[PDB]
RNA sequence: UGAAGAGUUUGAUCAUGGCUCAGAUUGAACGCUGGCGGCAGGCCUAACACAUGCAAGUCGAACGGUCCGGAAGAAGCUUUCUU
């Protein structure tokens, strides 16, 4: 069934009136791997807490990547905030060759070759929307056809 | 078939910006730590000054002598001497 990948997690701490309130944020990735991928980040005083509670915001808000022959359609340049992502479809034999942040979450994705690459800001947490958001500007012939 | 950097300016944040960290190479070394074996390699600093040996000779089917070697003579032997 659907699997889960846990990206990064960080301590997060907050100078609070009163002492030093401790909040531990946590990037997962939801995919059973044949055309839907999900990413959550939620969080929790508890390091477990946060990563269930992420699982669960990951599988709310999935998304339908049209693969194709284990690649994708069109290469796409997403742009999250300072952060900057690149895709580019490549032939069988390839390999997911991209970040952790953006293998992680094509891997589950079902992609099995792709380039891609981060510009600009590469914070891990707006690298990875930059990477479900170009997976949803994605089309194929039949959308560009039927839309058309 | 080809592309994942990070740390440091704030009380905190973003932007700008310089510095810095692990990579490969160099006819080297010093500091402290030594067993062995293959292969490879050695003044990257004063073209600073240099002891000593060595770094080009070979031809007599070009021509007269000396040195080294062999053979044959005048002699009973030796000296000497000739071809």
Do not use: C, W
Not at 57 to 86: D, E, Y
Not at 87 to 110: D, K
């Amino acid at each position: 069934e659907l699997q889960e990948k846990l990206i990064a997690v960080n301590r997060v701490s907050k100078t609070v009136k009163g002492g030093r309130i401790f909040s531990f944020t946590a990037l997962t990735v939801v995919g059973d791997g044949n055309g839907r991928v999900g990413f959550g980040y939620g969080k929790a005083r508890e390091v477990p807490a946060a990563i269930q509670k992420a699982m669960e915001k990951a599988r709310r808000n999935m998304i339908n990547v049209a693969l194709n022959n284990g690649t994708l359609q069109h290469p796409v340049k997403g742009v999250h905030t300072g952060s900057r992502v690149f895709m580019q479809p490549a032939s069988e034999g390839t390999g997911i060759i991209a970040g952790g942040a953006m293998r992680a979450v094509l891997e589950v994705a079902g992609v099995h070759n792709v380039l891609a690459k981060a510009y600009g800001s590469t914070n891990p947490i707006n690298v990875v929307r930059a990477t479900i958001d170009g997976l949803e500007n994605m089309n194929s012939p039949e959308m560009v056809a039927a839309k058309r």
